[PDB]
Design a protein around this nucleic acid. Structure first.
Ligand SMILES: Nc1ncnc2c1ncn2[C@@H]1O[C@H](COP(=O)(O)OP(=O)(O)O)[C@@H](O)[C@H]1O
Ligand SMILES: [Mg+2]
Ligand SMILES: [Mg+2]
Ligand SMILES: [Mg+2]
Lengths: 16, 1541
RNA sequence: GAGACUUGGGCAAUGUGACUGCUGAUCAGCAGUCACAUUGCCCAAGUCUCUU
RNA sequence: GAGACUUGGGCAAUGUGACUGCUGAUCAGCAGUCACAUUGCCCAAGUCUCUU
């Protein structure tokens, strides 16, 4: 693997 | 604190229910349960101040951790009126006694401390359990299993089951663990533990207003991908890491103790090998989990911690492995940064580049963490941010912190707002990254967070429980939640309103995470269901519950006084007791545990214990019992182990080894190992090792008697013996001038006075005698003239002549004296000798047959003078005359005869144009009618001196006596004439000064013979010897290669032993008070220096298994003046010392004359009249001439007089008056102080060492029973006295030396002494702080002996090379030359600071700044700018290194050569002005007196201010420094510079 | 050659002050090495009852 | 897999004890020596008595 896989900036602080 | 302490809506009924019975409260954190505990204390505050023995009580506050102990201590101090005891281990509690505990209980009405401290307090029964009114239990959810809470609670059953203390349980979370299913099965465990019901607030809804202080935060969660993708470099480094793991498994470190698994399964690697494996495992775990950029800081952490471990390593084997590990971690860092730099080619915006590389190389989870933080804060105000972040591991915390600083710095939006921090549990990791361990930050991170300095807090599980923190506004749980209690308390750390709880979870593990969280929610909702559904009933009668709960384990043991041993506590006490044994080189101080094999169980206990494990306990090789003890059959290995430990404890106590406290016993004394063999002779004098005197000058001045010399006892001649006559020669030294005509001519005359002896006399050297005209040299005849008393009447006439000589010609007499012929103490005769047949001189019987009664001067009338025949001119030449008309009876010496002069004489300077006849008629014509014989004869006369003690050197000056003196002429018939010749009179004046040197010269000869006989010197120069005359002690104030030392040159050779001159011994005899031209004080210093060196070397050789502290504290008493006094008293020397000033007129008893014998008897044999008779009574014994010159005793009237003298003293104000001061010389007593006697002891030592060398001196020191001989071999030379061991020598072979000696030849290039054994050098350069001290030692033992070596060498050199310097400057010069600062300058000049091995914070730079100061100042010896601290180590390094040089060859000449090569400039610079201490110099000023203020602790430095009246101005100056003794010198340094005006 | 006498100078024996070279005890602060004890946790393996 | 239980590696937290190291302050002991206030001894300069 040359480099990590970037993650999406947006998400949600979903209630648990 | 405040009056707003009114209770909440629940605590009143809470404490009301607590009063009825034991209770446990379950309320969430931040609800003031500590306050309701204080309220309980208030309710139970009835009987506190009363003592326990009178029925009083107290309380006990149980704790969990020392930090929480301090927190609760502050909480109870702020709002209570009682006294609280803060009890924590590792201080006090393990050293306190029952008295201290009881006294603290008397004052302290309540106590706080950790669990085990109270366990030891109660089980050992310092105080009875019933003495506590209530017991307060914090974190009661821990009260299960083998935790100390349960162990303490166990004591209640075995104790008195009446009037028990109350127990209260407090916990934010009731259950610890994951067995949350059927929580009713868990609650009742803690319920029966304290046998009290659980209670919770019923009105939760109404008190949720107060619960708003602990508001439930919102619960959100962040889901991140967990894709299994890893980079290439990780696989590159993993193979090398496992290669290093193998290589470490192949390391060759020294032996290590037994280490294996918990259940005693297969062996485990030693700690020093497995610690690095554990560290690398955790590093790899972090690298895999959090990302490459995380490892980029983790690797720096590994570097900085491996450097610490390398610095702290003792054995050299560990250092190589740690250096290899450090190089490996350096490679890892290099490759990580290589990856970083291979990336980041996209952009040149360094801030944006750093932020983007952090975003990229971060794992998706940490990326989500970063941007969740970014969106949560978004550049809000710093005060709005206050939160806790919880991760799992400590190195995780450190690495997360290290990456967060860089992330924050890479973002301007968070740069000014975020201030992260981290702290962890007990495994205290260094809170720094880029520096070695040198930090001292007293304020812990919790205090920093409480101050508001930090806003974001990273922490491990350390902060989950107990510690009280501000109600933080956020909670981010980076690592997965795994336990119920931790989740409950972490959600309780967002105590404030509007708080946010953020949990980071994996995408592929999100479903199980939400399932687990839901299960935790159900459990937390169901915890209160047991109490809500509980049937309303008490918790009391079920004692069987408690009995079954605690009887499951192993039963305890108890004995008298209530001391109870906890079986679960047996391992700790066994390990502590077995750790007190004297270990071998690698002896093991722990019991060895070995589980028996399968079929050995029946071998010991039978087939009944097939499944029940049995283990043996093996005692150490030095235990009280060398056997082994086996465990009872138990169902598991751990219970078997604890049972074996308990049985071992029981047997050890039943054998009496362990005391009632069960603590291991101690040691009493060590110094008394030698205090019995060295100081045993004090007891017969009333003294002991532990006895000292400090009052009334007791044991400081002691009354002693004197004995006549061995050659004067029984010396009185008798009839029919060969008597020996020694004539006296008086050689004039002064030139023959007009003033010195008579004292020269009449002193060179053949006529002399001699001494008749029945004994022999040695050859006595010439001594000087100072009279008014000058100095006289006196020598005694070597060969006596043999004469025989051929008639009793001849002896009687000689003795009468002696008596009348002393009675009249010198007037040295007293009324109560009696002519002595019976007593033999200093009894002899003096007799003139004249030419009778040839050159040999016989008795001048003409004198003795005439001068039985001296011619009594009387007045002559004109009728008598008319009948008186005309005197011839020869009748007065050389005769003695005196004037009878005058009232003066003083004798007058005839100087010049007048054959050519008439009474009508010529002119004179005063009576110009006057004759002597006219002058005498005018002056004394009242008592002369007329001169009937008025023709052809007058006399020219000169008077003679009256002084007798002709000892003072300068009395004979003539500079101002050179002036004109009158010429005196008398008329003969008016002056009475004596037939005695003034020729003999002039010599007979000097007699008492001759006798009081003959006395002590004979004493000195006796001592010289004794000290030449004991040391078996009977060689050629000691029987046919000729004694050099008396020397003058001028310093008595009465007006490149090396030169080898003369003090030691007479140790390896015998030709250089100079014969011990009798003058040296006589100097050693005479004290200062006698005031002669010679004294003992100069030899004093050398003698004391040799005594110090010998004592230190002897002790350091006999006791090579002792520390220098004990050596010093024993050689103190060995060399103390109290020891020397008693030693020399045992030597019975004091009978031969010269102290008194020789007052002849009053105290010097005549030899052949003494007071009456009956007086001696009844005044010396009677204790009741010992010192009651005073001199006033004695002087009244004016006995008759026949009663004092023939009869020899007192008459009846005189008898009554001197027997009532004491009674009259007892009936007058003379009662109680001292009659011993110079009025007890009749019995020969003398009062001498201790300082004199001790000084003569080492003065004899100095004489012996000077004339006979070091070896003979040390051999003689054996004679004084100070240096006790060894039984195996009596004693050896001062050199070759084999000393050394495990503290004077390095305990490593030659291979390990170079690893501690990086450079040796460079030290050699200056020192000049090629060491043949570098172990001494290494031990000399090893500082105590250096890690090897625990196994090899420190340079302390070497500095102790090098101190004495340098001291004595310098003292001897300054003694021998400077012959006319008093000790006032000798000690000053040596102290200046042995001062620590100049030693430091010597060290830095020769550059020994390079090789010195030490590891300490301040020592690291003190040496560098001092050497920089010296180099800037050009190596200027201070004997100074900005009060720079002197590195006192360097001087101690030289002190130890000189000894190291000495021991390598055991020769002192080589050491002196090296020392001279070292000190050559210093011994040429100091001799000029001998610089003194600057404080001393300031106090030396006449009126500019100093006064120094108190020490000031205003900061890390200290200072003192001084005042001096310079130019009569009340000036004030101040100085700063590290210590008071440093500023004081610098304060004086500024002040003395101020005197430069 | 002595005495009386004054001023000053110098030396030795008691009470205070202070320096040098060894040290010890106590208190406080900081720091290191090592052993052992308790709670809870996941991971891997194994035994038995037990569901399949 | 559940339950009972064991073993091994690992994690977090808590605590006891031993050992020595560094620093600052306080107290006291040992040896050498010096400066300021008390008696005795010897001198410098000068006065008087006594002795020609
Ligand atoms: N009745 C009260 N009177 C005074 N102060 C209170 C009262 N109740 C709570 N407090 C304060 O609220 C804070 C609660 O924190 P803490 O005592 O740690 O809670 P808990 O004791 O429940 O763990 C304490 O600092 C306490 O001073
Ligand atoms: Mg709290
Ligand atoms: Mg002395
Ligand atoms: Mg020293």
């Amino acid at each position: 693997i040359d480099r990590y896989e970037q993650v999406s900036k947006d998400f949600e602080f979903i209630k648990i | 604190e405040d009056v707003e302490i009114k209770p909440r809506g629940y605590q009143l009924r809470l404490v009301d229910h607590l009063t009825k019975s034991n209770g446990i409260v379950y309320l969430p954190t931040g609800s003031g349960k500590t306050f309701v505990a204080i309220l309980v204390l208030k309710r139970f505050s009835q009987d506190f101040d009363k003592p326990i023995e009178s029925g009083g009580k107290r309380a006990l506050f149980m704790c969990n951790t020392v930090e929480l102990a301090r927190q609760q201590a502050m909480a109870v101090r702020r709002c209570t009126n009682f006294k609280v005891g803060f009890y924590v281990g590792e201080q006090g509690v393990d050293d306190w006694t029952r008295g201290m505990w009881s006294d603290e209980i008397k004052k302290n009405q309540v106590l706080v401390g950790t669990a085990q401290v109270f366990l030891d307090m109660v089980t050992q029964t310092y105080v009875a359990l019933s003495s506590l009114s209530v017991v307060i239990i914090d974190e009661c959810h821990h009260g299960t299993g083998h935790h100390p809470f349960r162990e303490f609670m166990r004591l209640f059953t075995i104790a008195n089951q009446t009037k028990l203390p109350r127990v209260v349980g407090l916990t934010g979370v009731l259950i610890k663990g994951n067995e949350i299913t059927n929580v009713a099965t868990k609650l009742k465990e803690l319920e029966i533990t304290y046998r009290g019901n659980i209670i919770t607030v019923s009105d939760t809804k109404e008190m949720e207003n107060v619960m708003l202080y602990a508001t439930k935060p919102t619960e959100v969660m962040v889901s991140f991908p967990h894709q299994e993708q890893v980079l290439t470099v990780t696989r590159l480094i993993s193979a090398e890491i496992e290669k290093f793991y193998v290589s470490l498994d192949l390391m060759n470190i020294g032996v290590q103790p037994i280490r294996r698994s918990k259940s005693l399964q297969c062996l485990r690697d030693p700690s020093k090998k497995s610690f690095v494996k554990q560290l690398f495992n955790d590093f790899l775990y972090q690298m895999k989990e959090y990302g490459i950029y995380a490892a980029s800081i983790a690797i720096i952490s590994l570097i900085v911690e491996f450097d610490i471990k390398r610095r702290q390593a003792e054995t050299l084997s560990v250092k190589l492995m740690h250096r290899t590990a450090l190089t490996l971690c350096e490679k890892i860092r290099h490759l990580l940064v290589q990856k970083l730099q291979d990336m980041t080619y996209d952009d040149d915006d360094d801030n944006v580049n750093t932020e983007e590389v952090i975003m990229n190389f971060s794992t998706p989870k940490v990326q989500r963490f970063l941007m969740s933080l970014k969106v949560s804060f978004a550049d809000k105000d710093p005060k709005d941010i206050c939160c806790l972040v919880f991760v799992e591991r400590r190195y995780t915390c450190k690495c997360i912190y290290g990456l967060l600083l860089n992330y924050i710095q890479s973002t301007p939006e968070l740069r000014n707002v975020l201030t992260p921090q981290f702290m962890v549990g007990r495994n205290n990791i260094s809170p720094d990254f880029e520096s070695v361990l040198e930090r001292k930050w007293q304020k812990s991170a919790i205090q920093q967070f409480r101050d508001g300095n930090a806003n974001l807090m990273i922490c491990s599980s350390v902060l989950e429980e107990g510690i009280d923190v501000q109600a933080c506004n956020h909670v981010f749980i980076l690592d997965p939640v795994k336990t119920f209690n931790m989740y409950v308390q972490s959600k309780g750390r967002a105590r404030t309103t509007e708080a946010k709880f953020v949990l980071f979870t994996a995408d592929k593990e999100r479903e199980k995470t939400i399932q687990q969280i839901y299960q935790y929610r159900k459990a937390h909702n169901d915890i209160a269901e047991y109490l809500k559904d509980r049937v309303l009933e008490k918790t009391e009668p079920e004692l069987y519950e408690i009995k079954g709960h605690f009887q499951d384990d192993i039963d305890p043991f108890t004995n008298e006084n209530g001391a109870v041993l906890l079986p679960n506590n047996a391992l700790a006490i066994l390990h502590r007791y077995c750790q007190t044994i004297p270990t071998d080189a690698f002896g093991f101080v722990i019991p060895w545990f070995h589980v028996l094999q399968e079929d050995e169980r029946d071998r010991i206990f039978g087939v009944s214990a097939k499944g029940k494990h049995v283990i043996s306990i093996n005692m150490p090789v030095n235990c009280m019992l060398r056997d082994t003890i086996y465990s009872d059959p138990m169902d598991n290995v751990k219970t078997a182990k604890i049972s074996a430990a308990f049985k071992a404890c029981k047997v050890l106590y039943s054998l009496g080894e362990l005391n009632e406290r069960f603590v291991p016993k101690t040691l009493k004394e060590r110094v008394a190992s030698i205090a019995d063999v060295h100081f045993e002779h004090w007891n017969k004098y009333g003294d002991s090792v532990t006895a000292t005197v400090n009052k009334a000058d007791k044991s400081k001045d002691r009354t002693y008697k004197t004995e006549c010399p061995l050659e004067f006892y029984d010396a009185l001649p008798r009839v029919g013996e060969i008597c020996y006559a020694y004539e006296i020669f008086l050689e004039p030294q002064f030139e023959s001038c007009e003033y010195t005509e008579h004292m020269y001519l009449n002193l060179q005359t053949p006529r002399n006075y001699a001494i008749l002896l029945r004994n022999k006399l040695p050859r006595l050297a010439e001594m000087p005698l100072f009279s008014n005209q000058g100095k006289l040299h006196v020598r005694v005849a070597n060969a006596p003239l043999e004469v025989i008393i051929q008639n009793s009447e001849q002896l009687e006439l000689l003795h009468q002549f002696h008596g009348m000589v002393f009675r009249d010609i010198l007037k040295i007499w007293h009324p109560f004296f009696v002519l002595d012929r019976r007593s033999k103490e200093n009894s002899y005769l003096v007799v003139p000798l004249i030419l009778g047949a040839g050159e040999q001189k016989c008795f001048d019987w003409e004198l003795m047959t005439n001068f039985r009664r001296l011619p009594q001067s009387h007045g002559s009338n004109v009728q008598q003078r008319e009948q008186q025949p005309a005197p011839r001119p020869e009748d007065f030449e050389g005769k003695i005359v005196t004037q009878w008309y005058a009232n003066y009876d003083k004798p007058m010496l005839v100087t010049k005869v007048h054959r050519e002069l008439t009474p009508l004489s010529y002119m004179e300077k005063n009576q110009q144009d006057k004759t002597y006849y006219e002058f005498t008629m005018s002056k004394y014509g009242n008592r002369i009618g007329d001169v009937v014989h008025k023709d052809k004869f007058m006399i020219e006369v000169r008077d003679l001196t009256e002084q007798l003690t002709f000892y003072v050197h300068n009395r004979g000056k003539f500079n101002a006596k050179s002036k004109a003196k009158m010429k005196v002429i008398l008329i003969p018939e008016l002056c009475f004439n004596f037939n005695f010749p003034g020729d003999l009179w002039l010599k007979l004046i000097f007699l008492p000064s001759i006798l009081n040197r003959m006395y002590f010269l004979l004493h000195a000869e006796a001592l010289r013979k004794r000290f030449n006989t004991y040391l078996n010197l009977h060689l050629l120069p000691f029987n046919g010897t000729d004694y050099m005359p008396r020397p003058l002690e001028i310093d008595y104030s009465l007006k490149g290669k090396v030169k080898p030392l003369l003090i030691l040159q007479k140790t390896v050779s015998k030709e250089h032993i100079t014969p011990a001159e009798q003058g040296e011994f006589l100097a050693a005899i005479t004290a200062s008070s006698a005031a002669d031209v010679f004294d003992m004080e100069r030899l004093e210093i050398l003698g004391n220096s040799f005594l110090k060196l010998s004592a230190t070397l002897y002790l350091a050789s006999k006791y090579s298994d002792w520390n220098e502290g004990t050596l010093t504290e024993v050689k103190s008493k060995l060399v103390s003046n109290r020891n020397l006094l008693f030693c020399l008293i045992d030597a019975d020397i004091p009978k031969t010392l010269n102290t008194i000033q020789f007052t002849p007129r009053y105290t010097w008893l005549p030899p052949g004359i003494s007071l009456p014998h009956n007086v001696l008897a009844l005044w010396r044999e009677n204790p009741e009249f010992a010192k009651i008779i005073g001199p006033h009574n004695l002087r009244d014994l004016a006995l008759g001439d026949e009663e004092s010159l023939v009869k020899g005793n007192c008459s009846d009237i005189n008898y009554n007089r001197f027997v009532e003298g004491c009674r009259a003293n007892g009936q007058s104000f003379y009662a109680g008056a001292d009659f011993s001061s110079e009025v007890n010389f009749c019995v020969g007593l003398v009062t001498i102080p201790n300082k004199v006697i001790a000084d003569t002891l080492e003065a004899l030592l100095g004489v012996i060492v000077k004339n006979y060398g070091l070896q003979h001196a040390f051999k003689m020191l054996e004679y004084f029973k100070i240096c006790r001989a060894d039984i195996d071999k009596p004693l050896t030379q001062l050199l070759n006295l084999e000393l050394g061991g495990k503290k004077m020598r390095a305990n490593v072979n030659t291979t390990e030396i170079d690893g501690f000696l990086i450079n040796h030849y460079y030290l050699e290039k200056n020192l000049g002494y090629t060491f043949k054994d570098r172990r001494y050098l290494l031990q000399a350069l090893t500082h105590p702080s250096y890690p090897t001290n625990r196994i090899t030692g420190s340079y302390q033992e070497l500095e102790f002996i090098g101190n004495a070596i340098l001291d004595f060498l310098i003292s001897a050199y300054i003694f021998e090379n400077n012959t006319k310097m008093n000790p006032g400057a000798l000690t000053d010069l040596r102290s200046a030359l042995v001062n620590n600062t100049t030693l430091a300058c010597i060290c830095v000049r020769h550059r020994l600071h390079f090789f010195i091995l030490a590891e300490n914070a301040k020592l690291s730079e003190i040496i560098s700044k001092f050497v920089n100061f010296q180099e800037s100042q050009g190596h200027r010896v201070t004997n100074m700018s900005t009060n720079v601290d002197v590195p006192k180590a360097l001087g101690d390094v030289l002190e130890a290194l000189i000894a190291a040089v000495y021991l390598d060859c055991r020769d002192l000449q080589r050491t002196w050569e090296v020392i001279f090569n070292l000190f050559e400039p210093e011994l040429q610079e100091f001799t000029r002005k001998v610089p003194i201490n600057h404080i001393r110099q300031l106090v030396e000023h006449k009126h500019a007196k100093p006064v120094f203020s108190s020490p000031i602790v205003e900061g890390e430095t200290v200072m003192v201010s001084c005042q001096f009246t310079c130019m009569e101005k009340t000036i004030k100056v101040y100085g700063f420094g590290s210590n008071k003794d440093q500023a004081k010198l610098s304060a004086a340094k500024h002040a003395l510079q101020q005197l430069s005006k």
